Amino acid sequence: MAKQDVIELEGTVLDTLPNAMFKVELENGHEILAHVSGKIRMNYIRILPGDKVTVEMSPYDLTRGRITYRYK
């Protein structure tokens, strides 16, 4: 949405990182280090390279994010 608090972006994950980290590339082709939300850590709703995921990130960051939604 249009916000000034959190920027909601999507990206496509290419690589799997250890410790709930993921290497995801934004729609713009930018690299971001992502973190899956606690629900994805606890619940087997795993992210696979090639998946498109919704990353929430701060306007002061845009290089690190956190995923709450995986595209289904």
Side-chain angles (χ1 to χ4, degrees), residues 53-70:
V53 292
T54 316
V55 63
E56 66 210 90
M57 36 173 48
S58 307
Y60 184 74
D61 194 287
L62 194 144
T63 173
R64 282 72 59 137
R66 121 79 184 251
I67 285 71
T68 29
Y69 178 68
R70 56 151 297 120

Side-chain angles (χ1 to χ4, degrees), residues 21-37:
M21 250 71 64
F22 284 85
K23 170 181 161 298
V24 187
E25 275 65 56
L26 291 174
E27 308 293 94
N28 198 149
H30 193 243
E31 68 299 337
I32 56 169
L33 299 173
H35 294 88
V36 293
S37 75

Side-chain angles (χ1 to χ4, degrees), residues 12-16 22-25 48-51:
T12 309
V13 51
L14 298 181
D15 307 82
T16 47
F22 284 85
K23 170 181 161 298
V24 187
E25 275 65 56
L48 184 71
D51 281 315

